[PDB]
Design an enzyme around this catalytic site. Structure first.
Site, mmCIF file in Angstrom:
data_model
loop_
_atom_site.group_PDB
_atom_site.id
_atom_site.type_symbol
_atom_site.label_atom_id
_atom_site.label_comp_id
_atom_site.label_asym_id
_atom_site.label_seq_id
_atom_site.Cartn_x
_atom_site.Cartn_y
_atom_site.Cartn_z
ATOM 1 N N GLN B 403 0.852 -1.179 0.000
ATOM 2 C CA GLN B 403 0.000 0.000 0.000
ATOM 3 C C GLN B 403 0.901 1.248 0.000
ATOM 4 O OE1 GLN B 403 -3.849 -2.209 2.059
ATOM 5 N NE2 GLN B 403 -3.097 -0.267 2.962
ATOM 6 N N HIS B 405 0.177 5.072 -0.046
ATOM 7 C CA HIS B 405 -1.073 5.664 0.263
ATOM 8 C C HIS B 405 -0.996 6.643 1.372
ATOM 9 C CE1 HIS B 405 -2.523 2.870 3.733
ATOM 10 N NE2 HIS B 405 -1.213 2.846 3.694
ATOM 11 N N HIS B 503 -3.639 -8.329 11.667
ATOM 12 C CA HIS B 503 -4.105 -9.277 10.616
ATOM 13 C C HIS B 503 -3.962 -10.716 11.044
ATOM 14 C CE1 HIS B 503 -3.728 -6.293 7.006
ATOM 15 N NE2 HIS B 503 -4.679 -5.962 7.862
ATOM 16 N N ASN B 548 -4.906 -7.947 2.903
ATOM 17 C CA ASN B 548 -5.723 -7.615 4.060
ATOM 18 C C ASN B 548 -6.855 -8.672 4.079
ATOM 19 O OD1 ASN B 548 -5.185 -5.286 2.040
ATOM 20 N ND2 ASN B 548 -5.046 -4.172 3.952
HETATM 21 C C1 LIG Z 1 -6.217 0.791 12.283
HETATM 22 C C2 LIG Z 1 -6.903 -0.382 11.612
HETATM 23 C C3 LIG Z 1 -6.789 -0.513 10.203
HETATM 24 C C4 LIG Z 1 -7.285 -1.657 9.537
HETATM 25 N N1 LIG Z 1 -7.438 -1.630 8.157
HETATM 26 C C5 LIG Z 1 -7.894 -2.762 7.536
HETATM 27 C C6 LIG Z 1 -8.001 -2.810 6.072
HETATM 28 O O1 LIG Z 1 -7.675 -1.768 5.413
HETATM 29 N N2 LIG Z 1 -8.492 -3.967 5.534
HETATM 30 C C7 LIG Z 1 -8.782 -5.092 6.281
HETATM 31 O O2 LIG Z 1 -9.132 -6.110 5.680
HETATM 32 N N3 LIG Z 1 -8.675 -5.048 7.622
HETATM 33 C C8 LIG Z 1 -8.402 -3.866 8.262
HETATM 34 N N4 LIG Z 1 -8.344 -3.817 9.625
HETATM 35 C C9 LIG Z 1 -8.792 -5.030 10.340
HETATM 36 C C10 LIG Z 1 -10.309 -5.252 10.302
HETATM 37 O O3 LIG Z 1 -10.905 -4.116 10.964
HETATM 38 C C11 LIG Z 1 -10.663 -6.573 10.943
HETATM 39 O O4 LIG Z 1 -10.123 -7.665 10.222
HETATM 40 C C12 LIG Z 1 -12.189 -6.821 10.988
HETATM 41 O O5 LIG Z 1 -12.893 -5.719 11.604
HETATM 42 C C13 LIG Z 1 -12.486 -8.105 11.742
HETATM 43 O O6 LIG Z 1 -13.892 -8.348 11.710
HETATM 44 P P1 LIG Z 1 -14.595 -9.280 12.810
HETATM 45 O O7 LIG Z 1 -16.059 -8.986 12.680
HETATM 46 O O8 LIG Z 1 -14.100 -10.721 12.665
HETATM 47 O O9 LIG Z 1 -14.041 -8.752 14.222
HETATM 48 P P2 LIG Z 1 -14.058 -7.372 14.995
HETATM 49 O O10 LIG Z 1 -14.189 -6.180 14.080
HETATM 50 O O11 LIG Z 1 -12.871 -7.419 15.885
HETATM 51 O O12 LIG Z 1 -15.435 -7.431 15.834
HETATM 52 C C14 LIG Z 1 -15.591 -8.449 16.818
HETATM 53 C C15 LIG Z 1 -16.518 -7.963 17.889
HETATM 54 O O13 LIG Z 1 -16.876 -8.892 18.847
HETATM 55 C C16 LIG Z 1 -16.901 -8.272 20.105
HETATM 56 N N5 LIG Z 1 -16.678 -9.197 21.202
HETATM 57 C C17 LIG Z 1 -15.393 -9.549 21.451
HETATM 58 N N6 LIG Z 1 -15.442 -10.432 22.461
HETATM 59 C C18 LIG Z 1 -16.745 -10.603 22.815
HETATM 60 C C19 LIG Z 1 -17.367 -11.361 23.784
HETATM 61 N N7 LIG Z 1 -16.790 -12.217 24.588
HETATM 62 N N8 LIG Z 1 -18.706 -11.282 23.861
HETATM 63 C C20 LIG Z 1 -19.510 -10.514 23.097
HETATM 64 N N9 LIG Z 1 -18.926 -9.760 22.140
HETATM 65 C C21 LIG Z 1 -17.570 -9.809 22.011
HETATM 66 C C22 LIG Z 1 -16.340 -6.901 19.992
HETATM 67 O O14 LIG Z 1 -16.635 -5.905 20.903
HETATM 68 C C23 LIG Z 1 -16.411 -6.615 18.509
HETATM 69 O O15 LIG Z 1 -17.250 -5.582 18.179
HETATM 70 C C24 LIG Z 1 -7.957 -2.653 10.273
HETATM 71 C C25 LIG Z 1 -8.172 -2.494 11.654
HETATM 72 C C26 LIG Z 1 -7.616 -1.406 12.304
HETATM 73 C C27 LIG Z 1 -7.788 -1.351 13.778
#
Ligand SMILES: Cc1cc2nc3c(=O)[nH]c(=O)nc-3n(C[C@H](O)[C@H](O)[C@H](O)COP(=O)(O)OP(=O)(O)OC[C@H]3O[C@@H](n4cnc5c(N)ncnc54)[C@H](O)[C@@H]3O)c2cc1C
Ligand SMILES: Cc1cc2nc3c(=O)[nH]c(=O)nc-3n(C[C@H](O)[C@H](O)[C@H](O)COP(=O)(O)OP(=O)(O)OC[C@H]3O[C@@H](n4cnc5c(N)ncnc54)[C@H](O)[C@@H]3O)c2cc1C
Lengths: 574, 574, 104, 52
Positions: B403, B405, B503, B548
Site C-alpha cells: 500500500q 497511500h 491481521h 488484508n
Molecule cells: C487501524 C486499523 C486498520 C485496519 N485496516 C484494515 C483494512 O484496510 N483492511 C482489512 O481487511 N482489515 C483492516 N483492519 C482489520 C479489520 O478491521 C478486521 O479484520 C475486521 O474488523 C475483523 O472483523 P470481525 O467482525 O471478525 O471482528 P471485529 O471487528 O474485531 O469485531 C468483533 C466484535 O466482537 C466483540 N466481542 C469480542 N469479544 C466478545 C465477547 N466475549 N462477547 C460478546 N462480544 C464480544 C467486539 O466488541 C467486537 O465488536 C484494520 C483495523 C484497524 C484497527
C-alpha cells in the site's frame, strides 16, 4: 421560522434549550459537529464500560477531539531530507498554520471540540461555585442580594448538571489523601470532595454528566413530551447573524449545511450564541461586531469595541506523585499479619469496632479482602478502588483552585512502570487579571478549516499579581504534594502550555454598562444595543477566576433565560 | 429463545446477520461493547466532516480503542523516586499486565476493539482478493471449480462492503505516484488503486464502509423491514457455550449483562461466534474446546486439538517519503508561468489538449487554479487533493501486499514541519507460514478485564521462507519508495511491533479434515463434531497470506450462511 | 542557574558494595555489585524535605527551566560514595576497617 | 561531554528492554542474557546505577 435559535449544543446551549423548550418555545439548535456519543445524544463518551475499565485510553479520545485554535507557522529545521526530496526555501504556511500568530504571545494549548454536546462529551465534570472574589456582580451596592441571586442560580445549575459531593466517599485512596491533607492543614485550610457533575451507578461505574444530562437533545414533540417543540440540526456551520440597519435587532442567522453544501437564512424571534468562547467571538466578528483583522486602536470599531479584549486564561501547574511509604503502611495500620503471602497460614485480620482502630470497618474489610484474595500483590489498596477527588477551594490566602485527584485529560496518562494505585494528579489553577491588551482577534485574510476568519491570540500573563500568584501557586503545589509523596519521574512540577487548561473567559464579557465596565453583554447576557441577541458561555465571565467556569456560565444562562421568558412570547403550538 | 445467536457485531457478525435476518431467521446478536458512533449503528467513525477536515486527529481515536491483548510484566527501572515514595522490591504484576507472557515471544502490538461494529468502526477499508497462492482451498482437486466458488463469494462480499477501485481516480497525488511506478516497473509489475470499501459523496468527502454498510443493526421488525426479526444487545459479555454430553451439539450460550451485572443462558438453534480471532478462541477454550493453561504436548486436549495453534500474523514494514523535487516539478510541467507570484503580472496558463502535455486537462486545470488562487504557496498540488491509494498486489516474484497511500492508523501521524501534500506512506505486508509451535493460549489463573482467561502468545516469525521474504520485502520497500522520494526523517524504514498490523489468522483454522489438515472448522465454518456451532472471522484462514484478510473472512461467512440456510429453518413469525 | 542540594545518608550495615566470585570487569578483576537503598527514617524524610527546600528556595530567584524540572538524580550519579573502607577507633565497636591514622 | 567520556559505570544490571522490531532475519535473543559488560549479580532495584 422558529421562536428561538441556538447555535451550539454544548452544555450552555442545552441550558437554554432546557429552559426554553420547557416553557413552550419552538426551538431550533444548530451544531457544526455531528452526533457521535451513542444513542443518548450529546452524552459523555467516558460512560462506556470499556472506558471505565481502561481509563487511560480515554486520554486518546480527548486528544482526538481537541483541534488547536491557532498554530503558528512552524520553524523547525529538517535538514536530513534526502537531496532528491522537495525541500523548502522558506518557512511557508503549511498544514493549517496561522501566519498572523506571534508564537511568543499565543495560547498554543487552546483548542475546540466540534461534536454534538461540545466539550461536555469528554470533560472532567468539576463544578465548584466561585466565591465572591472570583465572581461577577449581578447586583451592585447590595452584597446580600448579589449572594442570594448567585445561590438561587447555582442551586438550579447544580440540579441540571446533577452535581454532588458524595460519589467518592467509599474510596480508600480518596479518604487517605483527604484525611492526610485535612490533618496537615488543620486550622488553616479546608479540604473536601471536588463537586462533580456525576451519578454513581455501581461501585465500579460512574455516569458522568454532560449536555445530555441537561437536555436530552431528542427532537420534539415526542411521546415523552407531546407539547414541546425542538429540532437539533447537526453538521450545520452557523456563519453570521444579520444586523438590521438600525443595529437594534438581528434579522436572520446565515447557515451552511455541510452535508448538502447549501447555504440558507433562518429567521427566529430570539438568537442565542453558545458556540464556545472562541467561536461565539468569531461568529460575531464575521457579522460586523468588533473589528476584523489585526487590531488598530486608531480606528476603533463602531459596535462592541470591547469584543475580543480583556481575555483571560488561567495559569495551570501540574505534577503527579507516588504515594509515600508511610501513607501506604497507614492503609493497613489496623491489620495483624501472620505468615508469609502465598503460604497456607497467611492471615490478615483486624478487630471490627475496636476503639483503637485508625480506620472504619468498611475500609478495613476492603483492605483485608484485597490482601487475602491477592497475596501476590504488594499493596493494600483494592484493585477497583475509586479515584481520589480532593480539593481545597480558592481563598484569599491561597488564591488558586486545586485538584488532587485522578482523571483523564489530553495529557498525564499513567505509564506502566509505577502502579496506578500509587499515582495522584495535582492540578493548581491560577486566576488571570483581565487586561485590554490581551486579545482574541480574527484575520481578515487567513481562514480556518470552515472558511471562517482565522482566530489569532495576542496574550501574555499580566505582570504583577497574576504572575506573582502563579509562581506562589507552583510553590504551594510543591509544598502540599510532598505531604502525600514525591514527584513521579516523567511528571515533574511544571506550567502547562498556555491555554491547554481550556478555561478561556472574557472574550465577550459581561457587565452593567458597555463603556464603564468595558463589556459586550449585560447581566441578562443580552448584547448591548440589540433586542434579541444573547450570548452564553465562559466568554461572558469578566473576572479573574481560578475555579472551573462551566457551572458559573450555566448559572448566567439560566438568568438570561429568565429575561427571555419575560420578554418574548412563544408562538402557538399548531 | 432465538433461531440464531451471533456473538460480536463487527463486519463478520454483520455478514451472518445480513444473510440470516434477510432470510427470515429470528436473530439475536450480542456485543460486549457499546453503541458509540452516531445514529448509524456500527458505522465508521471517520465519516464525520470534522475528521475528514482533520484526518491526523483520527489517529488518536484509533489509539483510544485498541486495547492491548497481552502486555508482559514491566521491567523498566525507575530509580529516581523520592526516598519517601513507596518503591517496589520486585517487578510485580501492575496495571493489568500478564505474568504468563514471555516478552520475547509476544505479539505486543496485538489489540482488540470492544465497540458495536468492532474494528470496522475505524479500519482503513482495504479489501483486495487473495490470489490462489494465498487462499484456502474450498474445492479439492479442481482448480477451476475452486476459482469459480471464490469468485462468486468475493463478488457477493464486495457488494456487501461496497468495494470499488474508482474513488481516487481524480487525485493528482494518486495519479502522480501511480504513473511513476507504472513506468518504472513497466513489463514487471502492475499497479492499480487499492480496492476500497468506500463510496464517494463529494470531491472532498468519502463515506468509508463499515459493519453498518453490511447490516444497519436496527432492531426489527421495523417500518422498513416489517417481517424481519433482529435484536442487538450491546454491553453483553458472552462467556461460554455449553456442550452436550456427547459433544455433538451446543445447548446454550452463557452471557453476562454488564449493566445489571446479571448472568443468563440464551437458547438458540444455531450459535455463531464472530468475536474476532483472539476472542473467538477465548470463548471456545472457556467452553472446554482445546485446553486451558500453558500448552502441554504430553497431555493433548480431547476436543479441537489444533485450536490456538498454527497462528499467523503478518510481518509489516513501514516508512514515509517526501515527494521528489522532480515529481513536484512534473506536476506543473505543462504550465507556462509569466511574471512573479503575488504581482498583477503573474500568469499561469496551459494549452488544453496539447500533444506535448504530460498530463490531462482535468489535472492541468486544477493545478492552474491552485497556482493562481494561492500565489503565496510554493507547491503546485491543490490543497484538497484526495490522498493517493496505490498498490501492486501480491505475486510469486514479490510475495507481499503493498500500500502506497495515506490513511489513519494508530501510528504515522503527519506532524507539522513538512507539508502533508508531500508525504506518502509505504506499508508492505508479508505472509507468514502456519507452524504448530506458534500459539495463542489462555491462562488458567490470570484473567482479563472481563474476568475471562487471559490471552497469552507464544510466537516468533518462522525461520525459512517467512523470514527471508520479510527481509526481501523491507529491501523492496526501500528500492521502490526511492523512485518517489527519500524517507521522511522520523518515519524511516522499520518493521512494526509484531501484531500491530492486526491481521492475525489461523487461531481456529479451516480445513477439509480435522486431523489431516490440523484444523478446527470445515469449509462451512462448522466446528468439527458439532451440528450447530459456527465460527466467522480471520481466525478461520489457514494459509500464509499477505493481503488484508477481512474480505476473505467475509467470503467464508457467506459460504457458512449457505450451509445454515440448507440445514436450519426459521421459526414461525409470531 | 543550577540548583543542586545534597542530603546525608545514615550508615547501615545492610547497605553494601560487594564483589562477584565469578563475574569480572574490563580489567579482569572481581565485578563490583551494590546492594543499596536510602535508609528509611531520617535519611528519607530529610531527602524529601530537601527537595521541598530546593523548590521553595529556587522560586525566589526564578521559575523552573522547562526540561530541568526538580528531580532526584539517579542514585550514585552524585559520585560522593563513602564508608566502603570506613575509619573508626576500634575495629569491632565502631564496625570499621582503618584506624584514625588510616592504617588497616 | 568530556565528563561523560571518562565516567565508566560501576555496575550495570542485565538489560531487559524488549527489542521486538528486529528484522525476522536478524539474530534475536531468547533470554535476557549477559551483554555489553552488564553485571548479572546486580539487582536493578537496589543499585547505585549512577556510580561511575
Ligand atoms: C487501524 C486499523 C486498520 C485496519 N485496516 C484494515 C483494512 O484496510 N483492511 C482489512 O481487511 N482489515 C483492516 N483492519 C482489520 C479489520 O478491521 C478486521 O479484520 C475486521 O474488523 C475483523 O472483523 P470481525 O467482525 O471478525 O471482528 P471485529 O471487528 O474485531 O469485531 C468483533 C466484535 O466482537 C466483540 N466481542 C469480542 N469479544 C466478545 C465477547 N466475549 N462477547 C460478546 N462480544 C464480544 C467486539 O466488541 C467486537 O465488536 C484494520 C483495523 C484497524 C484497527
Ligand atoms: C479535557 C477537558 C476537561 C474539562 N474539565 C472541565 C471540568 O472539570 N469543569 C469545567 O467546568 N470545565 C471543564 N472543561 C471545559 C468544559 O467542557 C467547557 O467549559 C464547556 O463544555 C463549555 O460549554 P459551552 O456549551 O459554552 O461550549 P462547548 O462545550 O465548547 O460547545 C460549543 C459548541 O458549539 C459548536 N460550534 C462551534 N462553532 C459553531 C458554529 N460556527 N456553528 C454551529 N455550532 C458551532 C461546537 O461544535 C460545540 O459543540 C473541560 C474540557 C476538557 C476538554
Amino acid at each position: 421560522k422558529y421562536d428561538v435559535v441556538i447555535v451550539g449544543s454544548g452544555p450552555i446551549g442545552c441550558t437554554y434549550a432546557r429552559e426554553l423548550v420547557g416553557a413552550g418555545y419552538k426551538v431550533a439548535m444548530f451544531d457544526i459537529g455531528e452526533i457521535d456519543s451513542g444513542l443518548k445524544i450529546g452524552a459523555h463518551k467516558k460512560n462506556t464500560v470499556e472506558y471505565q475499565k481502561n481509563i487511560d485510553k480515554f486520554v486518546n479520545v480527548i486528544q482526538g477531539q481537541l483541534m488547536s485554535v491557532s498554530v503558528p507557522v512552524n520553524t523547525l529545521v529538517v535538514d536530513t531530507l534526502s537531496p532528491t526530496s522537495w525541500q523548502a526555501s522558506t518557512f511557508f504556511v503549511r498544514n493549517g498554520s496561522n501566519p498572523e500568530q506571534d508564537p511568543l504571545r499565543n495560547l498554543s494549548g487552546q483548542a475546540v471540540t466540534r461534536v454534538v454536546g461540545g466539550m461536555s462529551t469528554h470533560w472532567t465534570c468539576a463544578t465548584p461555585r466561585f466565591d465572591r472574589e472570583q465572581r461577577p456582580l449581578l447586583v451592585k451596592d447590595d452584597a446580600d442580594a448579589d449572594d442570594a441571586e448567585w445561590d438561587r442560580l447555582y442551586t438550579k445549575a447544580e440540579s441540571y448538571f446533577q452535581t454532588g459531593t458524595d460519589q467518592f466517599k467509599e474510596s480508600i485512596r480518596h479518604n487517605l489523601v483527604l484525611n492526610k491533607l485535612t490533618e496537615e492543614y488543620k486550622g488553616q485550610r479546608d479540604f473536601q470532595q471536588i463537586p462533580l457533575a456525576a451519578t454513581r451507578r455501581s461501585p465500579t461505574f460512574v455516569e458522568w454528566s454532560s449536555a445530555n444530562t441537561v437536555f436530552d437533545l431528542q427532537n420534539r414533540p415526542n411521546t415523552d413530551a407531546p407539547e414541546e417543540r425542538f429540532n437539533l440540526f447537526p453538521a450545520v456551520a452557523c456563519e453570521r447573524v444579520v444586523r438590521n440597519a438600525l443595529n437594534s435587532e438581528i434579522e436572520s442567522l446565515h447557515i451552511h449545511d455541510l452535508i448538502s453544501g447549501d447555504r440558507f437564512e433562518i429567521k427566529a424571534d430570539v438568537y442565542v450564541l453558545t458556540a464556545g468562547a472562541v467561536h461565539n467571538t468569531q461568529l460575531l466578528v464575521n457579522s460586523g461586531f468588533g473589528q476584523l483583522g489585526r487590531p488598530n486602536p486608531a480606528n476603533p470599531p463602531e459596535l462592541l469595541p470591547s469584543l475580543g479584549s480583556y481575555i483571560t486564561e488561567q495559569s495551570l501547574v501540574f505534577c503527579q506523585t507516588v504515594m509515600s511509604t508511610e501513607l501506604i503502611d497507614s492503609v493497613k495500620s489496623d491489620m495483624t499479619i501472620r505468615g508469609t503471602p502465598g503460604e497456607l497460614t497467611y492471615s490478615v485480620t483486624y478487630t471490627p469496632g475496636a476503639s483503637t482502630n485508625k480506620h472504619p470497618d468498611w475500609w478495613n474489610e476492603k483492605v483485608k479482602n484485597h490482601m487475602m484474595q491477592h497475596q501476590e500483590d504488594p499493596l493494600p489498596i483494592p484493585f477497583e478502588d475509586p479515584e481520589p477527588q480532593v480539593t481545597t477551594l480558592f481563598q484569599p490566602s491561597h488564591p488558586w483552585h486545586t485538584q488532587i485527584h485522578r482523571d483523564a485529560f489530553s495529557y498525564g496518562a499513567v505509564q506502566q512502570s509505577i502502579d496506578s494505585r500509587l499515582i495522584v494528579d495535582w492540578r493548581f489553577f491560577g486566576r488571570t487579571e483581565p487586561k485590554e491588551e490581551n486579545k482574541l482577534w480574527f484575520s481578515d485574510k487567513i481562514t480556518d478549516a470552515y472558511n471562517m476568519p482565522q482566530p489569532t491570540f495576542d496574550f501574555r500573563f499580566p505582570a504583577g499579581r497574576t504572575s506573582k500568584e502563579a509562581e506562589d501557586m507552583m510553590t504551594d503545589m510543591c509544598v502540599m504534594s510532598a505531604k502525600i509523596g514525591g514527584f513521579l519521574p516523567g511528571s515533574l512540577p511544571q506550567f502547562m502550555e498556555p491555554g491547554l487548561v481550556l478555561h478561556l473567559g472574557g472574550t465577550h464579557r459581561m457587565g452593567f454598562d458597555e463603556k464603564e465596565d468595558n463589556c459586550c453583554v449585560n447581566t441578562d447576557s443580552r448584547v448591548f444595543g440589540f433586542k434579541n441577541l444573547f450570548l452564553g458561555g465562559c466568554g461572558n465571565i469578566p473576572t479573574a477566576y481560578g475555579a472551573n467556569p462551566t457551572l458559573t456560565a450555566m448559572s448566567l444562562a439560566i438568568k438570561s433565560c429568565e429575561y427571555i421568558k419575560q420578554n418574548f412570547t412563544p408562538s402557538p403550538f399548531t
